[PDB]
Write a protein that binds this DNA or RNA. Sequence first.
DNA 1: AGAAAATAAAAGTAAGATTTTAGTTTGTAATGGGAGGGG
DNA 2: CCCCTCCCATTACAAACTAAAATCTTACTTTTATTTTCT
Lengths: 133, 301, 84, 296, 94, 97, 175, 76
Amino acid sequence: DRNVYEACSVVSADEVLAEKIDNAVPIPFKTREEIDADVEKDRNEGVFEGNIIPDIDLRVVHYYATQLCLNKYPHLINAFDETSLITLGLLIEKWVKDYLTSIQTERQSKVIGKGPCEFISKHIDYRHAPGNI
Amino acid sequence: ETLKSANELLDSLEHSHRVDLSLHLYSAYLLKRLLYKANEKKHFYEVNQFVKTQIKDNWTSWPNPNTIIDPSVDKLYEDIPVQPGEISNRALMHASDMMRVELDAQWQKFLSKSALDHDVTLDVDELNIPNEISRNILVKLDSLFEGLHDKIAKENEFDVRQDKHSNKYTYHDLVSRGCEMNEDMTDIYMKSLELYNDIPEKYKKRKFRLPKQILKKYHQPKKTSSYLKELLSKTREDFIPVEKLLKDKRLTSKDKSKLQRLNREETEDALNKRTFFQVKGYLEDENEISDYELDDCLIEL
Amino acid sequence: ELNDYSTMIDILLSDMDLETVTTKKVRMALKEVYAIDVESQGKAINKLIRKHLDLVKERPRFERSLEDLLKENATLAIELTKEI
Amino acid sequence: HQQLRKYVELYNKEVEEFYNGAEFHPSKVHVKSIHEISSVGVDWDSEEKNTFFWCLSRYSIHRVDEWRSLLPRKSAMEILGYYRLLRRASASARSRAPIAYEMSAEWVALETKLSETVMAITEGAAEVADEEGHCEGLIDYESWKRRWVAIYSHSRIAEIRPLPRHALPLSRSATQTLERCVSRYTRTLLWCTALAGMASRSVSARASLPTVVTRRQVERALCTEARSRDLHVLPRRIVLTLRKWELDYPREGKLFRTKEMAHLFLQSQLSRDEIDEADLFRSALHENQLLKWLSK
Amino acid sequence: HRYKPGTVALREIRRFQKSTELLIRKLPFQRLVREIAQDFKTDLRFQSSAIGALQESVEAYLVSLFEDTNLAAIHAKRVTIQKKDIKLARRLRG
Amino acid sequence: KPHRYKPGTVALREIRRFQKSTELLIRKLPFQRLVREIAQDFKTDLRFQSSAIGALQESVEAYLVSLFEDTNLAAIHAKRVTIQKKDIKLARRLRGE
Amino acid sequence: VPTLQNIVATVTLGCRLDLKTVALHARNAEYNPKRFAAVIMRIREPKTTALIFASGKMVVTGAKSEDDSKLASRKYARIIQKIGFAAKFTDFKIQNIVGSCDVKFPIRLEGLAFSHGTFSSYEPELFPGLIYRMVKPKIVLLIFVSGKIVLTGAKQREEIYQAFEAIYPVLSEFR
Amino acid sequence: NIQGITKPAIRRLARRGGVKRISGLIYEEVRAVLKSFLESVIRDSVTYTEHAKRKTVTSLDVVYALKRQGRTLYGF
DNA sequence: AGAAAATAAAAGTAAGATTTTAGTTTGTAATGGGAGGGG
DNA sequence: CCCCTCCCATTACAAACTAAAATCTTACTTTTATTTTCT
């Protein structure tokens, strides 16, 4: 193909890229489990928290950015690369988590605590009242 | 027998491996970065031509008038709040609807993880992201792109006006844009360092050396008179931008190859330092001016 | 300062009907007009209202219209400027 | 004859209430709270409920992103969630607003006299003017004095119409703050122009690839930057100053001395109400109780 | 025992109604919105929700202005705000 | 103490006079040292053209002119005889910090 | 040590379900009895797919964890109940947990075919990997050429970890 | 028609901002601020509508119009 | 206390000298198309 | 088809220049604001 978006929409994008370079060098594929395995030492030290690779569906972000730019911002055609899309997912995840974090102490930390969970809490006793669900 | 179940198990793993785009975008980044590092000290011209002509920029560049790929995720679930290739407001409204689906998944994932840590059972009828909150996040995302577009449009008008009077974005830019929107990007910057700097250092560059066959394909002409020294001596301006100097036809291929290698090394250090400070913020002096407070208003006789 | 607050209570009671007067209502009016903090020495403050509320049953109820208020406000304002 | 001290306490108590303004029993707030055994939800303390309702009046719920710092243990979901329940409850509740009292023209005349008298006594406690600043400092105050006598003394603003010929002196503590202010803005300016182009290297022709800042890049950064960056442009400031002070100046001649800065200005520009009668009566009574209090 | 959501007291509802009530009447504000649209030679039509959104953002702006206006009066050691106080706040903000 | 009871006309000469580089509020040499010191924080070989420093000076001087104008307006509002620190703090407060 | 991917939970609804009506009421569930006699619907956040039978038995698929499967099962039961069929959430049972890990050491699978061929089979035509069945604990595992050992058929996390620990030394050697 | 915003509306709005007493001559000045701010939001709302090629102004257009001014609005 | 007169400060008017800005010329480097070769 | 070196025509533009507009120096008159005398 000519894109990684079409290649990710039996042959994977890795195979397309490998034949795009005539298999000159191995394709460096890193799964989510391996990515977290190479940052566990720094994760333990607390230098950062959460996942470094976004869990949001970047295809949905790409389609929205495509429609938004092709309708209002025609100067942004082909203006981004792979790292921009990955970072965009991390930033969008940050915006959602912003609405849930609070200053909680145990020194103080800006984390998700008691509040949001209890605000929508529901105690269920399925042994005697299975109809609550 | 169990082979059909095993075959279905294998197909699901392959299907999941294909669908996710983040790891494929990352693999493209790691391939280009590892190729340059293993082949920058020698054969920089070959690897630069090899990367630029085979792993083209349009492999991951976006958005395009082409590749209008509809995920169509609003027709798959119910736990949620157009002709193909169409570009219209109906498609834009359709795109926003699936964006709210993605935000809802993040909202529910965050709460569920927190509830387990704090040992709280959640009511499944209220896990939906509030409509007012999601509408605000979409406005933020829309404002992020219009800020980038506005700068380009204003810069073009500035260049046009001066001309009449006289007569690419990476994760560094996305971090900088977030700082312009008065967001705290310290956490994302730390995560970006691990993903783009710390992880690729684990790879062994010996595995990514270009083979002899590829090296012979992209040979550059040799024994050609260099013009950079003569060009620099006769120039009028004290400093010449690299981008202007790279496109000048008075420089040989070998002259540009050495400049491109130096530019790539220096830009990466400059880009790393630039986003490091932008994340830190300009208020490092800490000589804060006190605000208008209660003490400044009271009267004593 | 306790005697000073007594004058404030006397002024407030002279212009409100006594049918629905409550110790909380006068205490609220003290903060609304004179911005005095009622939370501190609240128990002492409440004693003054109750003490003053017994004394206002003697005189009768006089109601003055907007015109009477306007002309007397002008008299007080211009007079107060002269002492300054 | 003690209205001066009575006014001072009235002013001081009002100022404290305006600043330290932020009753309600503690309760648990849940998304299913409906109308006016254990309770479930999130704990909303009395100081939290008081802060929430005071913040709601002073700033709309739309500015919750700012004043949510006054509720450190409450996330934006909980604050916006609480607002959602109350809106549902209020619309579903059986029906049945503080006002600002309109003061007479005679009252404000008295208050202005009282305020002016107070500033006269308190003027002795103000910090005194500095001696002199020299060339070591960034700011040259001699130029400012020359500006005021030549530009700002001609202002036609009615409320400040009698204007002093010479600019007001500055205290030593004031000058230090101004010196710190320009240093803070210089960092802001450098981080918008010099740091932005940090990644664009050049070749040292008249000898590594350095980074070079040019007037072309600085003017481009000033004009094409976001207006929230509060970056100032000198030719734009001149026209704004003349409008702000309502100065009369000729319009036929050229405002700017050079074509370059005149061009820079062009680049920046293109880049029977019964409610009323009740309020009048309450205001007249409110003024009456204040005048009687002072007349004592 | 019964796990029940915490009830909102009636005094909380009244305070919320006091804080978030739209003080400007809808009909006079609607007419002003229409006049501006026709004064712009604009044929666009405003939805009722759009008019409501315009109104509820106007109150937030006006309250913020009055907060700054009070600071000007405080600076002059005054307890009432005058016309000159609003003029000073407008000049400095703009 | 002296007052101008008739606001005249601001002629173009003194409007143009303070647009000169020598008439700017910000001083040449101290601003250069300040710019270099701040630029020294960026650990890179960063260089300024002579005209680039001047262009930054006009922008900085524009900010100081605006700050002085608002500080004096606040001082006139309070009928001060000497501009105080809180006059600067009020102007910044009313400017959105 | 290995990371699980798929979780299938067994949840029985006390009421009797009408597949035709629930499909119409559901927004995106697709039902066609000609091929399959179950209603298919998916939820976004847990990324779980549930099979809904007319008999009331429901099996979900795609949970990343046992607890997430319970949360996903609750939402699936809640959706069915919201239709109005008075379903009940009873007898939650995890029936199979699938886990896998990557040893990062390319290992040939031909040798394991004949070194221990009694309980292990390697049909290259039928499957690209090697079928390996070890007795205790009862987890079925497959050997691949790259070394992505997958495990399936366990019950909980304690058993699935011990299965990897038993086969960890085996995968390290036999290059 | 700017007179539609009556005196009691301004008096109650001033109290919300912490202002306890007003001069009584500020009503005309506040109305000028009232109209001037309303001009900007309506202008940007119409401008955002043309860029979307729509024939009406909705609450979202006003929300986007206020976002360009750095002001947030919540669509409850 | 207020006005009216006196005095001094300020601004306005003018011309000639001198500085600053604006227009022109001119040299040559800068810029981009193009041919030609080579794979 | 895309790479390269080389050509060459045009255009950009800084440096030098000329010129015209602005402004500074000197001197003067006239309007404006401060202070003294007077009622």
